[PDB]
Design a protein around this ligand. Structure first.
Ligand SMILES: CCCCCCCCO[C@@H]1O[C@H](CO)[C@@H](O)[C@H](O)[C@H]1O
Ligand SMILES: CCCCCCCCO[C@@H]1O[C@H](CO)[C@@H](O)[C@H](O)[C@H]1O
Ligand SMILES: CCCCCCCCO[C@@H]1O[C@H](CO)[C@@H](O)[C@H](O)[C@H]1O
Ligand SMILES: CCCCCCCCO[C@@H]1O[C@H](CO)[C@@H](O)[C@H](O)[C@H]1O
Ligand SMILES: CCCCCCCCO[C@@H]1O[C@H](CO)[C@@H](O)[C@H](O)[C@H]1O
Ligand SMILES: CCCCCCCCO[C@@H]1O[C@H](CO)[C@@H](O)[C@H](O)[C@H]1O
Ligand SMILES: CCCCCCCCO[C@@H]1O[C@H](CO)[C@@H](O)[C@H](O)[C@H]1O
Ligand SMILES: CCCCCCCCO[C@@H]1O[C@H](CO)[C@@H](O)[C@H](O)[C@H]1O
Ligand SMILES: CCCCCCCCO[C@@H]1O[C@H](CO)[C@@H](O)[C@H](O)[C@H]1O
Ligand SMILES: CCCCCCCCO[C@@H]1O[C@H](CO)[C@@H](O)[C@H](O)[C@H]1O
Ligand SMILES: CCCCCCCCO[C@@H]1O[C@H](CO)[C@@H](O)[C@H](O)[C@H]1O
Ligand SMILES: CCCCCCCCO[C@@H]1O[C@H](CO)[C@@H](O)[C@H](O)[C@H]1O
Ligand SMILES: CCCCCCCCO[C@@H]1O[C@H](CO)[C@@H](O)[C@H](O)[C@H]1O
Ligand SMILES: CCCCCCCCO[C@@H]1O[C@H](CO)[C@@H](O)[C@H](O)[C@H]1O
Ligand SMILES: CCCCCCCCO[C@@H]1O[C@H](CO)[C@@H](O)[C@H](O)[C@H]1O
Ligand SMILES: CCCCCCCCO[C@@H]1O[C@H](CO)[C@@H](O)[C@H](O)[C@H]1O
Ligand SMILES: CCCCCCCCO[C@@H]1O[C@H](CO)[C@@H](O)[C@H](O)[C@H]1O
Ligand SMILES: CCCCCCCCO[C@@H]1O[C@H](CO)[C@@H](O)[C@H](O)[C@H]1O
Ligand SMILES: CCCCCCCCO[C@@H]1O[C@H](CO)[C@@H](O)[C@H](O)[C@H]1O
Ligand SMILES: CCCCCCCCO[C@@H]1O[C@H](CO)[C@@H](O)[C@H](O)[C@H]1O
Ligand SMILES: CCCCCCCCO[C@H]1O[C@@H](CO)[C@H](O)[C@@H](O)[C@@H]1O
Ligand SMILES: CCCCCCCCO[C@H]1O[C@@H](CO)[C@H](O)[C@@H](O)[C@@H]1O
Ligand SMILES: CCCCCCCCO[C@H]1O[C@@H](CO)[C@H](O)[C@@H](O)[C@@H]1O
Ligand SMILES: CCCCCCCCO[C@H]1O[C@@H](CO)[C@H](O)[C@@H](O)[C@@H]1O
Ligand SMILES: [Cl-]
Ligand SMILES: [Cl-]
Ligand SMILES: [Cl-]
Ligand SMILES: [Cl-]
Ligand SMILES: [Cl-]
Ligand SMILES: [Cl-]
Ligand SMILES: [Cl-]
Ligand SMILES: [Cl-]
Ligand SMILES: [Cl-]
Lengths: 263, 263, 263, 263
């Protein structure tokens, strides 16, 4: 009553498709392993953010919408660039670094003790450098003035923008926690769900905040544009609050042993 | 002829990705387990409906279409917010509560005896409170008048709207029954299919009814807007009829032992 | 070196998610089994085509595009209704009838000897009745004149339309053959790929032919509109040619034992 | 503690859904096996590029956007045609040829030693002939002048276009390497990720270069239009550079034994 697995096909069963941080135990603090993790975060964050920056540049060449109105097709395009861009980046780098590609996601995972603090700082630094490189590349590669930096819009105040950014980032981070960090038959598929979470968070936030949801995404274009709005802090504090909210929900479920009827 | 599973990778095989209601047997009536289920429905319904309400708010800032015409890009955006929003919510909460996020889905599952009536009532109450919280949050977070409450449009009568809502809800509930409640190799993937079902149901209904398809989705914005149209009942009776239709089809297939050639 | 499967989780492994026709051997010619198959095709085809007809009705209320031009957002909406509509229908009915939902797909599968001719005729008749019911329901449920019947457009001739319909249907049928009929680790996922194939085929065909790709989809609206264009035959012959082309490619690969390096 | 697999269901476990090149060992140099591989690349590339060419033809009938601006809905439609078109093609041909459908992808895989050079040349030649056939068919099937040939736009220079094409092709090729060539539990799903990578690469490139990303995609329409721009070379050199960049990253990760904490 077992189905035969041919020896040439055993790798597709034995080689689990799991985030790299699930297997960062003893031995992980070598220079080699720190470099692997940094290289995954650099490559992944660069390709995700470069892609999404060029896509936003293009989408923002659409004719202006009167009276401050929204442009649904434009918003869909930009959300695809970030949502599908992160999906591809995370699928590529999942077994390299785990594909965080976002200092707020790394923060949630350090709070959850999925990633130790020093490795987490290395990853976050890498993501921010990658975002600076992506912004510089996207600027160099496109004509016109930079149109992919974050700014308030749509009549949103700074306070509203802070809360939009926090709850959007929370959705993203809770997705990573429940699909990638939690170990089950759907862990392999987490990069898909993470990408859809980011897609959604962009449909919520682009019109009002530009959609930061990721300090590395917001910092790099500000550097490249040589321009920091005085409300730039919302793109740091909002995602940090969202990481903590997501962690807090996950932690409650872990204390409750959520997945088991009779612990 | 078996492929080796390394002990560190056994959790990805042994921990099934299955809806929580599949494992609610003896022991389930503890306060702990009722609270777990309520917390999954609250978190999931809040994040799904909050997201989708803000997305609809934004989409409804598009310039008006003349002569009552439709705006396909706008309709696509809103359908993404509800369809992908529910997808993310259900993937997050699948092993917490099963991710119903909708009193009509809970009703279908109580009729199918997947969920017992008292737990079902607790879940439905939770969903309605979550929808009120989401509406209040989305209103507080966005400028302008609320634009995410349901209303008839597109020249549709109340009777047409009732039938559109019933058949759209039936599609959703039959999806949950056949992909999540029925146990097979695709059960793990049900949250994806459920989200696409809801996406479709929004492309059918937004233009004509606003797309309720979920009494908790329709009630909360009416509370927040301090406004109930006299036809609000279609957003309760239509989804209830759809739950019964879906249940009736599933029940026929169960009586027939559909999946087996020679019972 | 094996991972434990808890007895309550064995159904998710032992109950394969496979099309019903894979298991239609001895015993299949009972009235019960013919009725099961017909009921799957009726329910699936009705929900798919009803959904997609209402979605097309709505999309076709968009303001007219000047000079015969195309409207990409409108075309995307309609393609979503048919592509995601068929995806949901096939996922629901996969283990009931196999989810053909299309006489041309049934024809390809009768040529491939996946489905015997008498059962195939029963299924095709059912699909055509379902399409008539869906058209009548969609008409009854929506205001205005029917806008979901097929017609030539975009400057396309009948001959061009015949070839567009044939090659689009071939893509669909080759997808079913290679993902659902062929037995492998991705068979379970065929409903997804089938839906994307149909999505693509609609982006190819709507503007020029209305996108028939399915005689049951084309016949029912003509009945409901009390209107058959003299070129209606392209919506029968084109899909029949496409079924044969797909079958011919698959048959060549089967003769070649494509999947095996050293037969 | 094992779940029963019924003998009729063993094929869905034993028949791995893996790219054909994973199993091209001894015996592969027969005429039969060369023909199988060529037939997969021909069928797959023809259906992908034919589909996407007709879709682009249609999308390019949209009313002109003033002042050189972008049209997000149009760009989304075209990206769907190539991204979902390649997805369907690769799912169909995965176990036939591996579904490269692109000389630059074949080049990356020859550099990675996944495909030997002579077979690789045969595949690339086939892809280019398929692209010529697809262009000729799409032209013959549609009214109007050909609108699916690549050209610079959006104010992009040749140098910018070369770099956009190189980095977009790199994303595609790194996706193939890390999801299809690398052997793990997600290899079966690589056709999905490959299609999303191509979707993204089109949202980056269409507006500025037309999106070549594939010498067979760029050559065939130039032949059919009897028109080669003097910058046509960017559609060869850009994808070749991208293949090398992707290979270089993958090779670094292979030298590092990326997937293992303690080699
Ligand atoms: C002398 C004591 C040496 C202790 C070496 C312990 C190395 C544990 O190392 C861990 O092993 C697991 C496999 O068992 C892997 O999954 C982890 O990737 C790895 O970090
Ligand atoms: C890895 C990223 C390298 C990208 C290099 C960007 C391409 C340079 O592009 C050049 O920019 C000039 C102004 O800077 C313009 O005047 C040129 O005509 C344009 O080609
Ligand atoms: C919604 C309540 C928490 C978010 C509030 C964001 C306030 C942003 O506003 C900041 O408030 C600070 C404290 O009052 C003042 O010190 C700063 O000058 C002011 O910019
Ligand atoms: C406390 C939140 C974290 C902020 C991250 C560091 C980004 C700050 O960065 C700095 O912004 C200043 C604005 O006054 C500028 O003058 C500098 O130009 C800018 O680089
Ligand atoms: C086995 C791990 C579970 C730990 C015991 C959980 C018992 C608490 O159970 C729940 O706690 C909630 C507090 O958030 C209360 O609101 C609920 O009323 C209560 O049922
Ligand atoms: C003295 C009698 C005590 C009866 C205790 C029965 C507990 C059954 O409990 C059930 O067990 C299943 C595992 O077997 C789990 O899947 C279910 O989650 C759980 O509800
Ligand atoms: C968890 C949800 C908490 C969200 C709080 C909403 C943000 C408050 O936002 C404020 O609303 C005022 C009117 O109410 C406006 O006048 C302000 O300028 C706007 O900032
Ligand atoms: C399509 C037939 C079933 C749906 C019918 C919806 C009727 C909604 O209309 C209601 O009909 C009731 C009964 O006649 C009257 O009592 C109510 O006043 C009227 O509002
Ligand atoms: C029978 C269908 C279920 C209805 C769910 C309860 C919602 C009713 O709710 C009530 O609607 C009334 C309209 O007359 C109002 O006057 C109240 O303002 C409103 O809260
Ligand atoms: C093994 C479980 C199957 C129960 C026996 C089913 C026998 C009925 O079989 C079917 O019943 C339908 C009623 O809906 C009739 O319309 C069909 O003609 C008949 O074939
Ligand atoms: C006296 C001879 C009676 C012959 C009865 C043969 C029944 C075969 O029946 C077949 O069995 C397979 C399981 O083995 C199932 O997968 C198929 O669904 C079923 O059609
Ligand atoms: C299962 C499908 C049943 C759907 C019934 C369709 C709803 C009837 O709808 C009615 O159509 C009339 C004209 O026919 C209009 O005049 C009405 O005001 C409209 O309500
Ligand atoms: C492209 C070649 C095959 C498709 C051709 C479609 C021809 C549709 O045209 C039909 O051609 C028939 C045969 O000449 C004539 O008998 C019919 O009157 C004419 O309508
Ligand atoms: C040979 C292709 C199959 C055609 C399927 C049958 C559809 C024909 O149907 C018939 O079309 C005629 C047009 O002359 C009409 O007069 C009838 O109104 C119509 O129902
Ligand atoms: C083991 C099953 C494989 C059957 C033998 C296949 C041998 C034919 O092989 C191929 O046949 C093609 C015909 O379409 C020719 O075009 C090719 O040149 C030839 O290599
Ligand atoms: C006399 C020596 C003959 C050597 C024949 C070796 C054939 C190896 O052939 C390989 O076998 C593998 C299965 O083991 C398959 O996966 C590969 O597809 C196949 O190329
Ligand atoms: C496999 C691809 C075969 C496709 C054949 C294309 C259809 C021929 O189509 C014809 O093109 C003529 C000009 O060439 C036009 O004048 C016709 O009226 C149009 O029908
Ligand atoms: C960005 C730097 C690498 C890409 C540069 C693309 C240059 C395309 O420009 C080419 O440059 C060649 C070498 O100077 C000259 O020989 C060619 O005439 C000129 O067309
Ligand atoms: C070196 C990059 C590879 C180029 C691939 C071959 C395509 C060249 O092709 C040739 O382009 C020439 C332009 O001068 C033309 O005159 C010919 O018309 C054209 O077919
Ligand atoms: C077991 C296979 C791993 C081979 C040994 C890798 C040791 C190199 O390790 C890394 O090399 C990088 C070079 O790219 C350096 O930048 C890093 O500082 C270093 O940690
Ligand atoms: C990507 C974001 C990385 C988060 C790094 C958080 C840095 C906090 O790390 C802290 O860990 C404490 C252990 O409890 C130590 O006591 C402190 O010294 C240390 O600063
Ligand atoms: C989310 C919607 C929850 C549906 C709850 C339905 C409430 C009906 O529950 C009913 O169950 C019956 C058992 O047959 C009892 O006899 C009744 O007393 C009870 O009201
Ligand atoms: C959905 C479309 C169903 C296709 C049914 C095709 C009907 C052809 O079936 C044919 O089978 C032959 C066996 O070789 C018989 O000899 C013929 O009598 C019979 O008509
Ligand atoms: C689709 C693109 C196919 C790439 C084919 C690359 C052709 C290079 O192949 C090369 O292989 C070398 C082995 O090191 C030989 O020494 C050379 O003779 C040969 O040209
Ligand atoms: Cl260590
Ligand atoms: Cl403020
Ligand atoms: Cl109990
Ligand atoms: Cl009415
Ligand atoms: Cl029988
Ligand atoms: Cl003609
Ligand atoms: Cl050989
Ligand atoms: Cl240049
Ligand atoms: Cl899977």
């Amino acid at each position: 009553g077992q189905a035969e697995i041919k020896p040439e096909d055993a790798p597709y069963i034995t080689n689990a498709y799991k985030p790299a941080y699930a297997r960062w135990g003893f031995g992980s603090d070598s220079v080699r392993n720190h470099f692997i993790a940094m290289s995954g975060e650099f490559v992944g964050t660069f390709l995700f953010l470069w892609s999404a920056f060029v896509i936003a540049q293009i989408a923002n060449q659409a004719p202006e919408t009167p009276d401050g109105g929204s442009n649904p097709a434009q918003l869909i395009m930009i959300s695809f660039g970030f949502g599908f861009g992160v999906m591809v980046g995370v699928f590529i780098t999942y077994r390299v670094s785990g594909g965080n590609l976002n200092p707020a996601v790394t923060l949630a995972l350090v709070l959850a003790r999925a990633i130790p603090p020093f490795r987490g700082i290395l990853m976050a630094f890498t993501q921010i450098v990658a975002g600076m490189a992506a912004a510089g590349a996207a600027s160099a590669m496109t004509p016109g003035e930079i149109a992919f930096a974050n700014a308030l819009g749509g009549g949103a105040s700074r306070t509203r923008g802070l809360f939009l950014e926090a709850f959007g980032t929370a959705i993203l981070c809770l997705t990573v926690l429940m699909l990638a960090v939690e170990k089950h038959r759907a862990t392999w598929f987490a990069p898909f769900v993470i990408g859809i979470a980011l897609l959604i968070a962009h449909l919520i936030c682009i019109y009002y905040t530009g959609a930061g949801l990721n300090p590395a995404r917001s910092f790099g274009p500000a550097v490249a544009a040589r321009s920091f709005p005085n409300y730039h802090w919302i793109y740091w504090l909002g995602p940090i609050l969202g990481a903590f909210l997501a962690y807090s929900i996950w932690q409650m479920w872990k204390w409750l042993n959520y997945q088991t009827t009779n612990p």
